[PDB]
Design an enzyme around this catalytic site. Sequence first.
Site, PDB file in Angstrom:
ATOM      1  CG  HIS A 124      71.815  22.817  35.464  1.00 36.32           C
ATOM      2  ND1 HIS A 124      70.445  22.876  35.331  1.00 36.32           N
ATOM      3  CD2 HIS A 124      72.163  23.873  36.243  1.00 36.32           C
ATOM      4  CE1 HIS A 124      69.982  23.921  35.997  1.00 36.32           C
ATOM      5  NE2 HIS A 124      71.008  24.541  36.557  1.00 36.32           N
ATOM      6  N   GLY A 151      73.836  27.082  43.989  1.00 36.95           N
ATOM      7  CA  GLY A 151      75.182  27.380  43.540  1.00 36.95           C
ATOM      8  C   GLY A 151      76.173  26.244  43.729  1.00 36.95           C
ATOM      9  CB  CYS A 157      75.241  22.522  40.301  1.00 38.41           C
ATOM     10  SG  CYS A 157      73.585  21.989  40.784  1.00 38.41           S
TER      11      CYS A 157
END
Lengths: 298, 294
Positions: B41, B138, B140
């Site tokens: 991502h 934040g 991830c």
Amino acid sequence: AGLRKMAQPSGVVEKCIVRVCYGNMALNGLWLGDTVMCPRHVIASSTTSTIDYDYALSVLRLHNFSISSGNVFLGVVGVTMRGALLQIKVNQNNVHTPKYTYRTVRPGESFNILACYDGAAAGVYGVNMRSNYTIRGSFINGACGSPGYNINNGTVEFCYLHQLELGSGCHVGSDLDGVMYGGYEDQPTLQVEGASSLFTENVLAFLYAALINGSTWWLSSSRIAVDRFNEWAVHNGMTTVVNTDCFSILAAKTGVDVQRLLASIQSLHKNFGGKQILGYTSLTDEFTTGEVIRQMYG
Amino acid sequence: AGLRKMAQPSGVVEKCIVRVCYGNMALNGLWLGDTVMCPRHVIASTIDYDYALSVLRLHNFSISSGNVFLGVVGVTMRGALLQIKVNQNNVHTPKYTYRTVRPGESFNILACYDGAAAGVYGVNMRSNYTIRGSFINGACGSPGYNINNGTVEFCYLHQLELGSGCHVGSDLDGVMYGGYEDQPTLQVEGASSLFTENVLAFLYAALINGSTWWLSSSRIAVDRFNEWAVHNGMTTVVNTDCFSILAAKTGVDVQRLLASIQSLHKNFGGKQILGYTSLTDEFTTGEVIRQMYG
């Protein structure tokens, strides 16, 4: 999203755990600088009548101690009584001592428990100090001396060293000054936990977290004044609400004021009616406003 | 005495967290040896990740451990992860393995922000391959782990949150749990059911702790219960040998607990068990045995 009772990362505290053995007693100590703190019960011999700890200390043989950090054994230089703790001077400085303070916590406040056995951390979990100065922990034989802590700015605030379990299975520690929470005695004799009440301000924090997480089914359209609520609270096993300043941020984030939540609490105290709120089927007071704010917003 | 959902101590994992930034994206990575693993991502603007990787410039990465920046040597696609080769070895890399968890299994989440650990808590993988975590923006790349005899088993890197607010990660092979997509497109969680083998473990913990108010005198056979389970939001019972020691210690067999579960479903919330929701499914038999007996 989500609400979980979480601990702060345990790494900086793990490096401070030692095993402290004396005779047939074995528990955990906290090694900071050149000092090891542990419950004085380790020198007791042992149960089940009243212990004269001063006498126990007067006949102690320093060499009968075994204190270790993993494989590293520590030499004992001296021992002094520190309330319900021993303050043991050792011959080595813990090079991994973090920046730290001591602070006694108050009922309703949250902290982290690092459950230790044989001088090594086994598990970490968050707790909240109940109104009767006990915590609902999980400890079995060997856990005494497990520390409780908070971390603020990389400074470790030590607030608890585990001391005993009451007949009902809840847990009592001392602070790092050696003062037992709740005035319980570090004696093998009969002690029963005092009455406890749900911390309403914490329950409010939980309901705000529920709203932030999209749980709204239980929310009252009715209100109740703090004054009126506090009259009901003391006949219904909950604490009085005195100030509502701690809710300004959460009230703004959600658009829901404290008075609506207090009405909700009254209807949820009896019954959740077969439903759940964030997985709970009963009101919980384990989360503080600070915990909720930090967890939802950082 | 007591029962609490605990995490294994996080120290050994904390030294493995890095911050990984690319373009306007910042998340967390896991630095082991000279490799940093993170959700792919981070290189995204549906997303064609192969295209994103084909135009990527290595110098656009910023990877840091504290205030120390790591030089990026190369990048390879690994399912829903990037495997980023760096110019330095993490000298605090523990002995480790990768293992994909299965529904009903417990593990630990180290919730990280800006490449630094912020919180640690235990979770349990649900029947729909999601976890009930707590993560905000934040998070991830936050890792999930178990510690097994000195070895860290990494089993999860955080990837996304669904509409309901439950959480999805990939294993360290880059295989997304549940087959959810790392795409911005809307996805809804599959139906989830309470993990019955875990409820059984919890009820045994309750008995050991002196909670018996809920204990049925009736019994139901495992397969007949399973037929009921699948219409009442609970999983089937497949494994029973694991309960042998607990049944022996308490004098209560699984069949008696299964009947108790049916009754608890009927007055759901009427009373707590050890202060928990009566049908708590977050504890495994192993977790319970460890907390009761060590």
